[PDB]
Design a binder for this molecule. Structure first.
Ligand SMILES: [Zn+2]
Lengths: 75, 150, 293
């Protein structure tokens, strides 16, 4: 899936469109009106991440053998 | 204002991408032997080849039919070329696949008229539906024999 | 291993005598007493186990694999002694004792199971330690005292020993656990960030200055800064969702944070300066924008 995200990031008709560059895997430093290269204004610091919910916990339980190792949380 | 949509079928990758590029070229020009040249440049035999061809034909005619500026372009003397290639090459001239693909050519498949009023998720639902229809037609597999009948 | 019950059955009453005077681990004196009782419990446990000092290998600074024993009661790695002993240094790294023949006695019976049981024991005792500092040290809505938090922030570090200096361990009151790459976890930080941020600014600031001065001087500080921003925003999620107030108060107070936000970005800009107030501002505006999105 990260290779698939790389492939979907590099199709040759959306890559010219500047909305998939400011979202889907390119640094936003091409936008010229911006603060300079600081230690805190990198792209990964202003990236997105998960919101941890119960169903995701159940998904993690199903990968990590929750019927055997952690039975009370699985049930 | 020509902000086009995403082609989700590049998950197949580096053998669907070549045949979809050659189908977009044969969309813009009129020579259709390029599709046959791309088909003899591929592994993953006749079902996967037919699935690549049908999804390439779908994504080109769909990205054409949805947009209001370039609607119904293969009717402009170009459906004859792709239909002669259908009549010649047996890679997609299976008569259930062929009667599906002709219906996709002349816009008489009732999945493009899916009438979802959300207009964002409508695109995604159409793409998954035509993807699973391509897989159920092109796939000669036991664990698709109920769902094809379904 | 039913050969340690008359030790821990003594240390239960020893902890009872240490906690009988002041049964409040949030202050200094019973906390330091419990730390010293657990520490000499562990080391007298090890002398009960395997003849004065199951140690990490002096070369690798970690636990031994295929354990070879010197004639001077030294437990080393097999890989470390095969990459070390073969030139003209047929002697000892620790006590300078000449080994006569060869590293031929390896102990595949006692020392592997000894390192296995001691690793399981450090895991259970570290689980004890994190449960104790989660429950009793962080009991009510008021935070503990200054010196207990200072000893907590100092027990994450394994300061100078003669060899790589200044590694980082997994919140242990012990010394013989290592990672030979500086890893930075988030267990003490999240258990510290269950309180209000207004009273724990200087503590996390001092921990950050320590991490900058000994562990992440010139490395990928982007990952550590992202870890602090994620822990701060999870802390604000906990202080809002487990709290009981309406949407109107949080909207008015985060709006008042927004429209009175001085930029001030020239302070913590250039290459290294990142205060915890600055990362708290960044996590707070990310949560304001999460609500706005
Ligand atoms: Zn070693």
């Amino acid at each position: 899936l990260p290779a698939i995200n790389a492939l979907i990031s590099q199709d040759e008709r959306i890559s010219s469109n500047p909305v998939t560059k400011i979202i889907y895997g390119d640094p936003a430093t091409f936008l010229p009106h911006l603060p300079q290269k600081s230690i805190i204004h990198c792209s990964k610091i202003w990236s997105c991440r998960r919101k941890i919910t119960v169903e995701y916990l159940q998904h993690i339980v199903e990968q990590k053998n929750g019927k055997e190792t952690v039975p009370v949380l699985w049930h | 204002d020509h902000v086009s949509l995403m082609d989700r079928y590049l998950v197949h990758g580096n053998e669907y991408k070549a045949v979809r590029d050659a189908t977009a070229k044969a969309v813009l020009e009129c020579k259709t032997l390029d599709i046959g040249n791309a088909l003899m440049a591929c592994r993953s035999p006749k079902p996967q080849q037919t699935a690549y061809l049908l999804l390439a034909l779908y994504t080109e005619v769909a990205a054409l039919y949805r947009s209001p500026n370039g609607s119904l372009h293969p009717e402009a003397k170009q459906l004859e070329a792709v239909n002669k290639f259908i009549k010649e090459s047996k890679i997609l001239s299976d008569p259930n696949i062929r009667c599906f693909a002709r219906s996709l050519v002349d816009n008489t498949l009732p999945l493009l008229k899916i009438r979802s009023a959300n207009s964002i998720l409508k695109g995604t639902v159409t793409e998954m539906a035509v993807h699973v229809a391509t897989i159920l037609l092109c796939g000669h597999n036991q664990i698709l024999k109920p769902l094809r009948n379904l | 291993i039913p050969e340690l019950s008359p030790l821990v059955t003594t240390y239960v009453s020893l902890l009872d005598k240490c906690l009988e005077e002041d049964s409040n681990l949030k202050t200094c004196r019973p906390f330091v007493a419990v730390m010293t009782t657990l520490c000499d419990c562990k080391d007298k446990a090890s002398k009960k186990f395997s003849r004065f000092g199951i140690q990490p290998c002096f070369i690798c600074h970690g636990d031994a694999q295929d354990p070879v024993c010197l004639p001077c009661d030294h437990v080393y790695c097999l890989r470390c002694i095969q990459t070390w002993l073969i030139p003209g240094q047929m002697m000892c790294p620790y006590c300078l004792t000449d080994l006569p023949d060869k590293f031929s006695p390896t102990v595949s019976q006692d020392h592997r199971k000894a390192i296995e049981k001691h690793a399981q024991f450090r895991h259970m005792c570290n689980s004890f330690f994190v449960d104790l500092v989660s429950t009793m040290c962080f009991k009510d809505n008021t935070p503990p005292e200054k010196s207990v938090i200072d000893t907590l922030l100092s027990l994450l570090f394994v300061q100078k020993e003669l060899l790589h200096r200044e590694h980082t361990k997994s919140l242990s009151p012990f010394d013989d656990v290592v990672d030979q790459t500086p890893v930075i976890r988030s267990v003490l930080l999240k258990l510290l960030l269950k309180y209000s941020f207004h009273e724990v600014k200087d503590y996390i600031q001092n921990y950050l200055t320590q991490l900058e001065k000994k562990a992440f001087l010139t490395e990928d500080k982007t990952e550590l800064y992202l870890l602090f921003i994620s822990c701060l925003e999870d802390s604000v999620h906990q202080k809002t969702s487990a709290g009981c107030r309406n949407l109107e108060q949080v909207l008015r107070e985060e709006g008042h944070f927004l429209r009175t936000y001085s930029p001030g970005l020239q302070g913590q800009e250039p290459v290294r300066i990142a205060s915890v107030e600055y990362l708290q501002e960044v996590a707070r505006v990310r949560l304001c924008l999460d609500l706005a999105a």
